[PDB]
Subunit: 168 residues, 2 copies
């Protein structure tokens, strides 16, 4: 039995949460998981914003068409990249960090969903505004987290036709 | 005890391998792990090239910087994205897929490393011409896989200065 592989295969996007907040110890483990990502030339260009402010969460919800569930959580994490530290890899490093965070969540009985910010200038504008992100800090995503309100089922995405040998 | 977190925190880039091939069933599980990634609009734009041809591995080892370990493995997995399927987010989706693949490797006692291809045009061209990739298919990386030659140490990347509360 491989519990890591099981978490990987059972992870799903969770968009509905119980009312209760997530414990600070669990939030910190989510962050620590993200920071364990690999990183081009080990620059470590990620920055994590833990957002619990009701007004900010609601304002972002009301400006992000595919992130309306921000109104229905008490906490979200915004993964950002520092474009001075890694102008050609922050979006790769931070995507790997994001995936660690989502797996960490699944592993601790939490629900989470990756909602895009970058590369959409309208989404970037509101997130940068509400969180006072400096010009060299680019928000990749908003990740609401919470205890799942119901049983959710993973997608089975295996497709042998997306496997190739020695060339296309 | 959280085995998934344990794997996340103990993953490291492994660049030195036992001179022996990896079981096909393990390679398949790597790819299944990759395919389980989240995907913008569920467009699943990933394509995986399993590379066992010696000349292909050696040619990429020669042409790519920081890719010398390709000479020392029997097999590598090249993660690619279909830009017609996901023109704005393929490389984000494919980075999440890549991180699943790396974690899967670590969980099965294998060693792996992300070697950079995207976003460097000269690197992209090497991989494209070696693997006969159609123009709408972009190579993200090359991931050599093997049994680790030696015990390797993970990095502790935790830094509280990269954690922010309610904004920058
Ligand atoms: C986007 C990206 C590009 C990378 N490029 C290379 C590469 O070309 N060659 C290599 O040996 N390692 C490469 N790495 C691995 C990093 O050097 C490594 O993740 C970093 O040193 C942190 O070490 P760790 O993976 O052991 O935690 C890359 C990693 C990422 C995420
Ligand atoms: C780059 C990226 C952007 C995404 N953007 C959003 C988004 O804006 N809103 C949302 O509800 N889900 C978003 N998703 C979640 C996807 O819809 C989801 O991963 C996909 O439907 C597959 O489902 P699964 O995560 O349950 O396997 C995003 C995922 C990725 C990887
Ligand atoms: Cl075999």
């Amino acid at each position: 039995e491989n519990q890591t592989l099981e978490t990987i295969l059972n992870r799903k996007s969770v968009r509905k949460y119980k009312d209760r907040p997530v414990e600070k110890e669990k939030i910190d483990k989510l962050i620590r998981a993200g920071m364990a990502a690999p990183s081009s030339r080990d620059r470590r260009p990620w920055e994590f914003i833990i957002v619990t402010d009701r007004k900010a969460l609601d304002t972002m919800a009301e400006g992000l068409p595919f992130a309306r569930m921000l109104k229905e959580t008490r906490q979200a994490i915004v993964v950002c990249g520092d474009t001075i530290k890694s102008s050609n890899a922050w979006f790769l490093d931070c995507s790997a960090a994001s995936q660690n965070l989502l797996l960490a969540a699944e592993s601790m009985g939490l629900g989470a969903v990756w909602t895009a910010v970058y590369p959409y200038p309208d989404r970037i504008e509101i997130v940068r505004k509400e969180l006072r992100l400096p010009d060299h800090i680019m928000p990749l995503n908003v990740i609401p987290v919470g205890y799942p309100m119901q049983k959710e089922t993973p997608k089975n995405k295996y497709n042998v036709q997306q496997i190739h040998h020695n060339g296309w």
